[PDB]
Amino acid sequence: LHHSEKKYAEEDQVQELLKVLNEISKTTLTLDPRYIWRSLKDLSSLRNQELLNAETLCFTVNVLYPDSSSFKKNLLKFITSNHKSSVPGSAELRNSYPASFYSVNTEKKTIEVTAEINCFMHLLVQLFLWDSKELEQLVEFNRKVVIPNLLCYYNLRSLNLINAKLWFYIYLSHETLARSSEEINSDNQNIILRSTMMKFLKIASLKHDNETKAMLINLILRDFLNNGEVDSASDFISKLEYPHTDVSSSLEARYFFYLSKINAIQLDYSTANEYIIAAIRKAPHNSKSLGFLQQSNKLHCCIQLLMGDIPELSFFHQSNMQKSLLPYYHLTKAVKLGDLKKFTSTITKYKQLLLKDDTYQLCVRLRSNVIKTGIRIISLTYKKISLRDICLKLNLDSEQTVEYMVSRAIRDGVIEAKINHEDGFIETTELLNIYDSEDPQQVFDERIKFANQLHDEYLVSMRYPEDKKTQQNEK
Amino acid sequence: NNNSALSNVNSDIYFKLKKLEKEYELLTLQEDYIKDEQRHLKRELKRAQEEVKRIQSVPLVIGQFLEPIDQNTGIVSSTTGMSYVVRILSTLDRELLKP
Amino acid sequence: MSTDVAAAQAQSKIDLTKKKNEEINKKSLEEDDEFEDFPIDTWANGETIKSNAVTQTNIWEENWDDVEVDDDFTNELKAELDRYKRENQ
Amino acid sequence: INISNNLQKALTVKTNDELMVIYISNLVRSIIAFDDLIENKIQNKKIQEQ
Amino acid sequence: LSESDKKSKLISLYLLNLLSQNNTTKFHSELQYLDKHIKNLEDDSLLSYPIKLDRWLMEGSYQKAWDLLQSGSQNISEFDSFTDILKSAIRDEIAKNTELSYDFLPLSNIKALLFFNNEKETEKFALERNWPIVNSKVYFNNQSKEKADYEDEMMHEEDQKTNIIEKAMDYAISIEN
Amino acid sequence: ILDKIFYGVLDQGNGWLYVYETPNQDATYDSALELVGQLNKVVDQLFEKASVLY
Amino acid sequence: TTAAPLLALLRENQDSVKTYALESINNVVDQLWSEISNELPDIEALYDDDTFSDREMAALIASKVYYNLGE
Amino acid sequence: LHVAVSDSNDDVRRAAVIALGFVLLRDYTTVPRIVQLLSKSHNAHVRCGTAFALGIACAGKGLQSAIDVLD
Amino acid sequence: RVPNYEVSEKAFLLTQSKVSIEQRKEAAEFVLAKIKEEEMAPYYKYLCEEYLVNNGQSDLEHDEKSDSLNEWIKFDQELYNELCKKNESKIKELNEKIQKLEEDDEGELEQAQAWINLGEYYAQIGDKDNAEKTLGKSLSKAISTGAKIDVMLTIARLGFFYNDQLYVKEKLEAVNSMIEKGGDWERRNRYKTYYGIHCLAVRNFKEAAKLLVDSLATFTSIELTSYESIATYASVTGLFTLERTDLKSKVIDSPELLSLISTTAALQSISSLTISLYASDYASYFPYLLETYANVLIPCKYLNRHADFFVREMRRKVYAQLLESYKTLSLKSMASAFGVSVAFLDNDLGKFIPNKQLNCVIDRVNGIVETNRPDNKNAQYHLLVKQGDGLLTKLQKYGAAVRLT
């Protein structure tokens, strides 16, 4: 029973413990140790579920615990206490480790390796919480213990790398609890949580660890936007302190998505669209990335519709994600066909859907775009057209009504016309002749500049693995 | 276990490592030097090709390539009526040179 | 689909075991899939037939009869209407 | 300048070939390094054996 | 984040005040923050009023916006203190759109647009914008030409435009680097 | 015009005939298109060899 | 939550009010630093004046926010 | 270093490489890296001078790297 | 295997209600006679399922609505009884024979031909599945390689017969892999015909135009719909893909189209549209278009869904053809020639200009339609810049992953 599963599971945890130990004790190469540890977590979450769940307590007693065994027992009671073949003398050794040394070195006293035992202990904890899906007390318990400990060290870059990945989970459980239960307590500690992240982020500037900085930035940007204040988030990003050294495919895709959401609702859709295109691009394409991609698509359509430029029908059609993009497809059709009444119905029919996903606020400004897109088609199709004919086409009352709408629309430059209320028709002003302007030299210069950017990025990247590789042993 | 020595680090920063921060500026000076060296050898490439080009121009004597004996030396026989074993020049066919 | 060439982003950016932890953790921050929150409250999404004629189950490439409706009946009528106007011009 | 724009891009292609050939090279040096570390055991064992 | 009895009225005032300062950027930034605490819990009740005003100025229904401010003084309690600022504002937004929509337009046609009732109000707004009135015709050509020269007078434009000679210098030295 | 034996354009509503003998492609245009179009195949083919990196 | 109530106090005049307003910011000056970076010139003006016993405080808020920005 | 590359005559080329190890007599460890590039040189003179500089540099305080370069 | 292509058409007409009703009940008389004779009741079972609530709404074992305008449709149990006899007697004879030729040696060919005979009978009555199972048995067995190829196309016909294209693509994917194994030029001509009908279903007609004219040049139209149908198809696709220059050349000039004349209505309408485009009579083009939808596009099983698309595109071809030729036209002159009025002209152009094909304007004020189609340095530049932007996009994309790892 007891002895069987826990011992088996323990064999893998010992092997895992040394993978962290050996890289950091010989000093990190930054990017490479990091990646390994990510591969390590894929394995651990599975093992934690499997073969009881006291596999960790059995382990905690095996390694040098300073007080870590107390916190473990409390996690354990909730999912039904186990504690047989996790007592001393049947799960204890202080030998078989170079991670805790032999017994004699513990006794005599030696240098701390209890830091990395602790960080790694806190891994198993963060893991435990997510895997079981524990809610309520456990969220408070874990957070309050772990973070004081990370500051009782000497704030080493070796230990910063490992514990940075702990921050993601601390953050997940707080939001989950807040979404489930509406309570004054959850509101109250959210102010503590922003405060803490900024505190760490200062510390990690000093100590210059780029991963700790990239992760802490993304969690707190997400938090401000969930509570809906734009201004705090915008002020934060324009200090330009995001790193690019230790950053990842997911991590940079995430940043850009925040950048999109801020700039669109600030009424600049050119600057918003720049980011969202970047976000889809960095991200992998998997069934595990499905969530991220799914939400990226939803935001993309609307940013584009707000410009008055329309997404193609093949987008939605060949999507495997098409039965959630169905209110979004109707947004495309309704704007394009210019019909006031379809729009009205769409955002009323699909109001719960739009409001769930938070995209309903950008759909309000898409009301304006119905008119704007319809007047645009008309500028393309007709060069000279009476004011009267226009009022029948979009169903407007006065000559006066169309004239207010058109002028504003060409303040933005969307339609590309000029009104002649000296003769009572609207004249289209697009007359091309852009290869007969001076602008084309300038259009090529930016492209040339992007090709120079890849030329640098190639040369500098190439040599970076190669220093290490020529130093590496070979026959 | 527990604890270490925090004075061991603080000591090394001012003493040894200050000398080594300065040493890293002398390898930075190396970088500026070999930035010019790398361009200088591009100029010297131009000059080594130009000199070859003189040799290639006339006067020349006709011969006929037979066959290789190596991938950089061949054997020809001239229109003089003499077999000469000849170094083949770089920057020519050696796949359509063989017949 | 997705921005730019989908197939080009799909081939460039692919799963590794290193990216695997990251790809899940990212998803968890977008609060699940949010495509299995969808079919629950709609109790099964239908089809578009409101303005499509070749719908969206095409086994070859979609047309633009997916935003337009049957215009041959209008053509037939215009023709006939035009013949009276010209007859009695 | 259109002809130059294209010519600068046509060299990114040349560079991009190199990057891949070096990331392949580095991949072989990795395999070589592991193979030696295994082989030291076989030579250690041969002395005990005889 | 707020449980008041007057909460409904005060958020209404919040949004009208944004509009009076004339930053549409500030309005939409806030709209998202308010959105959270009205989601299924107030929605639009009297809080429709400022969202409609902003929507109309974006849609370009300046006709509509004018009637809407006025009927808000049929339920007057301090709606009038926000009505004055926004009457001036409406005139100004049109003046920005109608630069690019005429080369000349009559006195009689402009009067209508900027919602003046009398001549004295019309001519004064034209002079501040440097649009001359001759034989009762108001000219957008004077401001549009004027603005164009003041741009050329200023320095930004050597680098922003990029000088063609300088472009080639950059081409050369990237290859040599 | 459709045959393209002086390739020009008719004004019906001013009743005029305009004749163009100008070129409507250039050499420069032609071979720019061939070159970029070929390099597109190259770039796919470079990623295809290096599928062993991952 | 928002420190915008505390910002509102800065711009409002009366010394006794400003006296309170600097002390409020100073509690949460280490803990919040992107909710208060818009009123840094008002704060600098208080340090520049010498009708305050709170010149020392005013200047301290300014400094704590500015290193976090990068300056 | 600048004169060794720029001045193409053989005396001037040879002298300046010899001259480096007197400057960096006490920093004899880093010299193998810096004249690594001049050991490989297509100019005979330069390599002649490479060899003397390394001899002088690591004469009384040894160092493995130079012995290998000099082979 | 033979009667399959014929019967499939006639049944498809029934489904339609955009055709003449008169045509339907001539079809109904014929198609049912043959269902009794060749015992095609499985296929009948399949057909009624697929209708459904357009046709068959006058049958006894279904629910009766006013959707069918036919009544000669009547599925009964009488059909079923006949099935049981004719299938029992035949199947059983062929089963005993397969096991006989297991006894005989070199029997692999002998068993192959018997399992082909079985695969014909299941083809005859319906069943694509049971022919498929049996002609794979034929496939393993030693038979000539040319027979293997022929077998594989034999199963593909069955996907046409059923009216599911997605079955046919998998069954022609096997043909494409076997073609050069036999190397036969004899089955190459057969492959152009099958794959032509398949590519007539695809939106892209580009492959279809090339195929469907080789089918005209080399006389292959067999085990599939008639030579006259082959020609009809060739014309439609000819028109859609090929420019005005290449159109005369390849469609209006073809010895095979001229020699076959137009003896059927379907073939007559489509050819009539083509002749009037070149001859530049546009007042016969529009009525001829309506003839086209009626008697070709809608009666076909592969242009059913491109019926609207061809109507539209053809109006688009001709307008654009005229706008090349003219830098100014009036609404009146243009409308009169097309046989529509000015209002009617506005709306048809008002779709086609946002579909990015005709690149023109309309004045209502002055009433002239001017042409805004560049051909000069502006056109060259728009196109070239997009492709070089497309090179840059791959370069960023492809570079970024290799560095990242």
Q: Interface of chain A against chain E, CB under 8 Å?
A: 187, 227-231, 265-267, 355, 361, 364-365, 367-368, 371, 398, 400-401, 403-411, 418-422, 441-442, 445, 448, 452, 455
Distance CA C28, CA A293 (A): 13
Q: How far is CA E136 from CA E101, E108, E124, in A?
A: 18, 8, 13
For residue C11, report the phi and psi dihedrals to the nearest 5 degrees. -75, -40
H36 touching B (Cβ < 8 Å): no
* Cα distance between residue G30 and residue A195, in whole Å: 8
Instruction: List, in sequence order, every residue forming a beta bridge with B84; answer none if it has no partner.
Output: B76
Torsion of CA C2, C4, C6, C10, to 10 degrees: -110
C10 and chain A: CB distance < 8 Å anywhere? yes
Measuring CA to CA, how many Å separate C65 from each of G60, I239, I318? 67, 20, 20
Q: Which of B43, B81, B89, B45 is closest to B64 using CA atoms?
A: B81
Gyration radius of chain H over CA positions: 11
For residues A19 and A23, what is the distance between their CA atoms, to the nearest angstrom? 7
Token readout for F53 is 């990196």
Cα–Cα distances in Å, from I366 out to A280, I325, I329, I361? 49, 21, 11, 12
Cβ neighbour number for residue I304 with a 10 Å cutoff: 17
DSSP 3-state of A166: coil
Which residue among I365, I374, I403 sits closest to A425, beta carbon to beta carbon? Answer: I365
> With an 8 Å Cβ cutoff, is I353 touching chain A?
yes
Q: Kindly state whether D30 is in contact with chain A, defined as any CB-CB distance less than 8 angstroms.
A: yes
Among the partner-chain residues I328, I391, I405, the one whose CB lies closest to the CB of F13 is: I328
The answer to whether residue C43 is domain-embedded is yes
Burial class (CB in 10 A: 0-12, 13-18, 19+), H57: buried
- Compute the distance between CA of residue A283 and CA of residue A296 in angstroms, rounded to an integer: 10
Give the whole-angstrom CA distance, residue A22 versus residue G3. Answer: 46
The distance of I362 to chain C (nearest Cα, Å) reads 20
> Do the Cβ atoms of A313 and C26 come within 8 Å?
no
Is I145:I181 a contact under the CB 8 Å cutoff?
Answer: yes
Distance to chain C for A289, nearest Cα, Å: 5
Query: Could you tell me if F8 and F17 are in contact, meaning their C-beta atoms sit under 8 angstroms apart?
Result: yes
Question: CB-based contact (8 Å) between F48 and chain I?
Answer: no
**Phi, psi at residue I80, to the nearest 5°?**
-60, -40
Q: CB-based contact (8 Å) between F51 and chain I?
A: no
I380 within 8 A of F25, measured Cβ to Cβ = yes
The answer to whether residue C80 sits within a structural domain is yes
Label residue B55 exposed, middle or buried (CB < 10 Å: 0-12, 13-18, 19+): exposed
Pinpoint the alpha helices (H) of I126-254.
Answer: 129-140, 145-162, 165-173, 179-182, 188-201, 206-212, 214-217, 227-241, 244-247
- First-to-last alpha carbon distance for chain A, in angstroms, is 49
Instruction: Write the CB contacts of A414 (distance below 8 Å, at least 6 apart in sequence).
Output: A308, A372, A376
Q: Are I393 and C3 in contact (CB under 8 A)?
A: no
Structure-token pair, residue C89? 């011009």
Residue of chain B whose alpha carbon sits nearest to that of A99: B1
Count of H-run helices and E-run strands, chain B: 2, 3
| Rounded CA separation E122/E107 (Å) | 8
- The answer to whether residue A111 neighbours chain B at the CB level (below 8 Å) is yes
How would you classify the pairing of strands I368-370 and E137-138?
Answer: unpaired
DSSP annotation of I249 reads I
What is the secondary structure of I291-303 as a DSSP string? HHIIIIITTSSSS
Burial of A373 (0-12, 13-18, 19+ CB in 10 A): buried
Q: Phi-psi category of I141—alpha, beta or left, where left has phi over 0 and alpha has psi -120 to 50?
A: beta
Those residues whose C-beta lies under 8 Å from the C-beta of residue E108, and which sit 6 or more positions away, are E136
Q: Can you tell me the distance from the alpha carbon of C58 to that of I302, in angstroms, rounded to the nearest whole number?
A: 12
3-state secondary structure chain E: CCCCCCHHHHHHHHHHHHHHHCCHHHHHHHHHHHHCCCCCCCCCCCCHHHHHHHHHHHHCCHHHHHHHHHHHHCCCCCCHHHHHHHHHHHHHHHHHHCCCCCCCEEHHHHHHHCCCCCHHHHHHHHHHCCCCEECCEECCHHHHHHHHHHHHHCCCHHHHHCCHHHHHHHHHHHHCC
Longest dimension (CA), chain B: 91
Partner chains of H (3+ C-beta pairs under 8 Å): B
Would you say G34 and G56 are in contact if contact means Cβ atoms under 8 Å apart?
A: no
In three-state form (DSSP H/G/I as H, E/B as E, the rest C), the secondary structure along A73-94 is HHHHHHCCCCCCCCCCCCCCCC
How many DSSP H helices and E strands does chain G contain?
4, 0
State the residue range of the domain holding C89: 23-89
Q: What ranges make up the beta strands (E) of A363-452?
A: 384-386, 417-420, 425-428
- Does some domain include residue C29? yes
What A422-428 contacts at long range (C-beta under 8 Å, 24+ apart), as own/partner pairs, is A422/E102, A422/E104, A422/E105, A422/E106, A424/A386, A424/A387, A425/A384, A425/A385, A425/A386, A425/A387, A425/I365, A426/A379, A426/A384, A426/A385, A426/A387, A426/A390, A427/A383, A427/A384, A428/A379, A428/A380, A428/A382, A428/A383, A428/A384, A428/I361
**Three-class SS state of A253:** helix
Chain D contact partners (≥3 CB pairs within 8 A): A, F, I
Q: How many CB pairs under 8 A join D and I?
A: 18
What amino acid is encoded at G21 in this protein? A
Amino acid at H5: V
Q: Which residue has the tokens 């495997």?
A: A320
Residue I101 burial (C-beta neighbours within 10 Å; 0-12, 13-18, 19+): middle
CA distance E113 to A168: 57
I212: tokens are 């469907």
Long-range Cβ contact pairs of A266-269 (< 8 A, separation 24 or more):
A266/A230, A266/A234, A266/E25, A266/E28, A266/E29, A267/E24, A267/E25, A267/E28, A269/A303, A269/A304, A269/A306, A269/A307
What is the interface size between B and H, counted as CB pairs within 8 Å?
A: 19
Residue of I164, I173, I206, I167 lying closest to I191 (CA atoms): I173
Q: Are I304 and I311 contacting, i.e. CB atoms less than 8 angstroms apart?
A: no
Task: Give the list of residues 6+ apart from residue C64 with CB closer than 8 angstroms, or none.
Answer: A313, I355
Closest CA to A255 of A291, A305, A217: A217
Which residue in the block uniquely carries the two structure tokens 């080493």?
A156
d(CA I165, CA I199): 10
Tell whether D4 lies on the interface with A, counting CB pairs under 8 A: yes
Where helices occur in A50-165 by DSSP H, the ranges are: 55-62, 68-78, 103-108, 114-132, 137-149, 157-163
Q: Which residues pair with A426 in a beta bridge?
A: A385, A419
* DSSP designation for I360: B
Q: Chains contacting C with at least 3 CB pairs below 8 Å?
A: A, F, I
CA-CA distance, E148 to D37, in Å (whole number)?
A: 75
Closest residue in A to C12 (Cα) is: A284
Confirm if I222 and I213 have CB atoms less than 8 A apart.
no
User: Does the residue C13 lie in any domain?
Assistant: no
Distance of CA B10 to CAs A24, A40, A89, A152, B35, Å? 20, 34, 42, 18, 37
d(CA H38, CA E42): 79
> Does C8 reside within a domain?
no
Which residues are registered as beta bridge partners of A386? A425
Contact assessment for residue I31 and residue I9, using Cβ atoms and an 8 Å cutoff: no
Is F18 strand, coil or helix?
strand
Residue at token pair 């089918």: I215
C54 located within any domain:
yes
Six token digits for residue A354: 């739009």
Beta strands I326-330; F8-11: pairing state: parallel
Please indicate if any CB of chain A lies within 8 Å of the CB of B6. Answer: yes
* C67 belongs to a structural domain: yes
Count of other CB atoms within 10 angstroms of residue A472: 15
Residues of C in contact with A168 (CB under 8 A): 25, 29
Q: Identify residue F44 by its one-letter amino acid code.
A: D
Backbone CA torsion sign across I168, I173, I176, I177 = negative
- Rounded to the nearest angstrom, the minimum Cα separation between C65 and chain A is 11
**DSSP codes of every residue in C2-54:** -SS-HHHHHHHS---HHHHHHHHHHHHHT-S-SSSSHHHHTTS-----SS-SS
B73-78/B83-87 β-pairing: antiparallel
How is residue A79 written in tokens?
């999912």
Query: Tokens 């992760």, residue?
Result: A215
Given an 8 Å threshold on Cβ–Cβ distance, is B1 in contact with A112? yes
User: What tokens appear for I101 in the block?
Assistant: 């030729």
Q: Is H30 in Cβ contact with B26 (below 8 Å)?
A: yes
- A197: which 2 tokens? 């992240």
Rg (CA), chain F: 22
Using DSSP, state whether I10 is helix, strand or coil.
Answer: helix
From the list A38, A286, A294, the residue facing C21 with the nearest CB is A38
The residue whose two tokens read 């070929």 is: F38
- What's the rounded Cα separation, in Å, for the pair A184 and H14? 81
Considering only CB atoms, D5 lies closest to which of I388, I399, I405, namely I388
What is the number of structural domains in chain C? Answer: 1
For G47, other C-beta atoms within 10 Å of its C-beta total 18
Strand-pairing partners, residue B63, are B78
User: Å from F50 to nearest chain D CA?
Assistant: 6
SS3 assignment, position A290: helix
- Provide the 10 A C-beta neighbour count for residue A431: 9
Closest listed residue to residue A163, CA positions, set A25, A34, A76, A45 = A34
Task: Give residue H63's region: left, alpha or beta (phi > 0; psi -120 to 50).
Answer: left
Q: CA of I317, closest CA in chain F: separation in Å?
A: 13
Which chains form contacts with chain I, at 3 or more CB pairs under 8 Å?
A, C, D, F
Residue of F nearest to D27 (CA): F53
Experiment used for this model: cryo-EM
Query: G38: which chain A residues are within 8 Å (Cβ-Cβ)?
Result: 235
The CA distance from F35 to the nearest CA of chain C, in Å, is 20
Q: What is the DSSP letter of B59?
A: P
Q: Specify if C16 maps to a domain.
A: no
Within 8 A by CB and 6+ apart from B64, the residues are B76, B77, B78, B79
CB-neighbour burial class of residue I232 (10 A; exposed 0-12, middle 13-18, buried 19+): buried
Residue I345: C-alpha distances to residues A148, I165, I286, I287 (Å): 77, 37, 12, 15
